[PDB]
Amino acid sequence: KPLREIPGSYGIPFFQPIKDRLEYFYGTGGRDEYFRSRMQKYQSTVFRANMPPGPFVSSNPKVIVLLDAKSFPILFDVSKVEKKDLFTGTYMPSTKLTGGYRVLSYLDPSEPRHAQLKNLLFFMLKNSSNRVIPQFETTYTELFEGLEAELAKNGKAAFNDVGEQAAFRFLGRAYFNSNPEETKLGTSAPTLISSWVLFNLAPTLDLGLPWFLQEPLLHTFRLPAFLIKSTYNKLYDYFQSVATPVMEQAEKLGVPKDEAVHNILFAVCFNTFGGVKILFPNTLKWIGLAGENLHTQLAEEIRGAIKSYGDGNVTLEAIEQMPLTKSVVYESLRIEPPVPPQYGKAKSNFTIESHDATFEVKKGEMLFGYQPFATKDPKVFDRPEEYVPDRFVGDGEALLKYVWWSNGPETESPTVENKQCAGKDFVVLITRLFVIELFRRYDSFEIELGESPLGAAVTLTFLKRAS
Ligand code: HEM
Numbered sequence: 001k002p003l004r005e006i007p008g009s010y011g012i013p014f015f016q017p018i019k020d021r022l023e024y025f026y027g028t029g030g031r032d033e034y035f036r037s038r039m040q041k042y043q044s045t046v047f048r049a050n051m052p053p054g055p056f057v058s059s060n061p062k063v064i065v066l067l068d069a070k071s072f073p074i075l076f077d078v079s080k081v082e083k084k085d086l087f088t089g090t091y092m093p094s095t096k097l098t099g100g101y102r103v104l105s106y107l108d109p110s111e112p113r114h115a116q117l118k119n120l121l122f123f124m125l126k127n128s129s130n131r132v133i134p135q136f137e138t139t140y141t142e143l144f145e146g147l148e149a150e151l152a153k154n155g156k157a158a159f160n161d162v163g164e165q166a167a168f169r170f171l172g173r174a175y176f177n178s179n180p181e182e183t184k185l186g187t188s189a190p191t192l193i194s195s196w197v198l199f200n201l202a203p204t205l206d207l208g209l210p211w212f213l214q215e216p217l218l219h220t221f222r223l224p225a226f227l228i229k230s231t232y233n234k235l236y237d238y239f240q241s242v243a244t245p246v247m248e249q250a251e252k253l254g255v256p257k258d259e260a261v262h263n264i265l266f267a268v269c270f271n272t273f274g275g276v277k278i279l280f281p282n283t284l285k286w287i288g289l290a291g292e293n294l295h296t297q298l299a300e301e302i303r304g305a306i307k308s309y310g311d312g313n314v315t316l317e318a319i320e321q322m323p324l325t326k327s328v329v330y331e332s333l334r335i336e337p338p339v340p341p342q343y344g345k346a347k348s349n350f351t352i353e354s355h356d357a358t359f360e361v362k363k364g365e366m367l368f369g370y371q372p373f374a375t376k377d378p379k380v381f382d383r384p385e386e387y388v389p390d391r392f393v394g395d396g397e398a399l400l401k402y403v404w405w406s407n408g409p410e411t412e413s414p415t416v417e418n419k420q421c422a423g424k425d426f427v428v429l430i431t432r433l434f435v436i437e438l439f440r441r442y443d444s445f446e447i448e449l450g451e452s453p454l455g456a457a458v459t460l461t462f463l464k465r466a467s
Pocket residue numbers: 083086087104105106107114118121125267268271272273274275276279338339341342343405406407418419420421422423424426427
């Protein structure tokens with residue numbers, strides 16, 4: 001693997017970043033093609049490139065693209081890449097959209113508040129790791145139920161919207177033993193959250209709207225924060241009066257209540273919610289398309305393990321007796337990473353390598369990985385583009401080191417020293433509980449997709465039951 005100069009150009013300083021941007025957003029093939037075609041052009045899985053949002057919202061579009069499993073890892077190595085204000089990318093949503101504070105996600109582990117706010121989050125999870133399983137069944141048994149009636153009523157039932165309401169219902173319930181739909185928020189949190197997240201991510205979001213609408217309105221400037229302000233407080237009011245326990249630990253940690261509430265609100269609405277809004281529909285999708293031997297076996301495993309080890313109910317012991325169910329949730333996480341882009345700014349002059357070359361990285365350069373590609377490396381995973389349910393079963397467990405949806409080997413856990421998903425163990429559980437509940441009710445199901453910028457736009461059409 002010879003030392004080579006990283007291929008790719010940045011072109012003229014203003015025109016290029018804009019032109020590429022348009023390519024990234026409207027070129028036939030989507031952003032996936034933006035990378036694949038460059039991978040092909042330079043016969044390299046590591047190359048130079050501009051990345052949105054470019055122009056006025058971003059002052060530095062220049063990055064180095066990582067597309068292979070060999071190089072991609074450097075991004076986890078916090079000893080070499082910095083993780084300051086790049087949670088999104090080459091731009092950071094105005095702080096006005098987050099209480100004036102720079103929330104946890106944007107902090108480098110070398111920042112005291114990082115370890116502080118992360119522990120605060122570790123408390124919120126642990127301190128609620130007892131309502132998770134109970135409160136989950138309760139919320140999705142509301143959901144499937146609600147979906148069952150809507151099905152027989154008109155033939156089909158959309159999953160996405162309802163699923164999000166349940167998601168936020170389940171989060172409040174567990175994290176704070178609260179049903180938000182019993183407060184002023186009503187069943188209208190998913191909308192508040194979207195409206196708010198849109199303001200933040202607007203510069204790098206493709207809503208599938210005409211380029212002559214998206215470019216002027218969403219991709220050249222930042223949206224006036226004052227507009228969202230009203231909506232943001234509606235969510236702020238909720239968290240402030242329900243996150244009491246967690247709001248106290250924040251003081252015990254040296255963090256003010258106000259700043260804490262803004263970080264809690266972010267973690268629950270942006271991190272948690274934003275992620276499940278995507279992962280669940282896709283997981284329900286990949287399984288759905290798997291056929292029936294999966295369904296029949298998934299329902300078989302879950303129930304058997306529920307009797308044998310759960311005594312007639314879901315428990316951590318029983319889950320550990322669901323090898324297929326575990327692998328399934330992992331595969332979903334491998335085949336379609338809910339949060340694709342990982343960034344890292346080089347702190348020193350070091351070297352990295354692809355499957356067939358080496359490259360010099362200089363202090364100050366931004367490294368960018370497109371995970372969906374890296375986790376689909378044929379040199380690592382067989383029939384990569386396929387969803388193999390039992391891929392991580394048996395000796396497959398040894399590949400977990402390669403599942404990076406949480407910004408790090410699935411075989412590792414989040415710490416204050418790293419930038420790995422704080423709710424890592426949390427999502428793996430609830431995504432299993434998701435699949436677990438599903439088949440603990442249905443012997444099988446069928447579904448038809450639909451396109452959307454979110455991902456699946458799933459609608460159910462059939463639902464065999466137990467008994
Ligand atoms: C399945 C849903 C979720 C997905 C896909 C997801 C994904 C991610 C990713 C990719 C990062 C890395 C960002 C970076 O580049 O620096 C991240 C960070 C983070 N996530 Fe999540 N996440 C999910 C759920 C959650 C939940 C439920 C929590 C709540 C406790 C959470 C808390 C965090 C925190 C606190 C960080 C930053 C930690 C740090 O500063 O080191 N995430 N998440």
